[PDB]
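Partitioning-defective 3 homolog
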Amino acid sequence: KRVGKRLNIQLKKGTEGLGFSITSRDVTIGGSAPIYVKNILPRGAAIQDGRLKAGDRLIEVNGVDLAGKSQEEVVSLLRSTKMEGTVSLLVFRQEEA
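Structure:
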C-alpha cells in the first residue's frame, strides 16, 4: 500500500495564482487520473503561506472531488479562482520510507 497522510491547506488568492504547479498521472484519456503538485513555484500564496509543499497530491479543492475531473479541469477550477478568495486545497503527503 501507499504510506503517507492527508493535509488541509487553504491559500488566500493574491492575483499571482497560488505558486504551485500540478502534474497529471495520465491514467486515462478522460476518466479518472490522480493530480499532484509537480512543483511549488517561488511566486504564489502557497510558498508564501508555507503550508503546502511539493510531492503532494490534491485530494480535494474548495470542497470539490478531483477524483475524476481532469488536469485542465483541476487547473481550471483553481485558475477560475480570483484575488480575495481563500482556496482550501486538501493535499496528500507521502513519505519515502
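The chain has one domain: 1-97.
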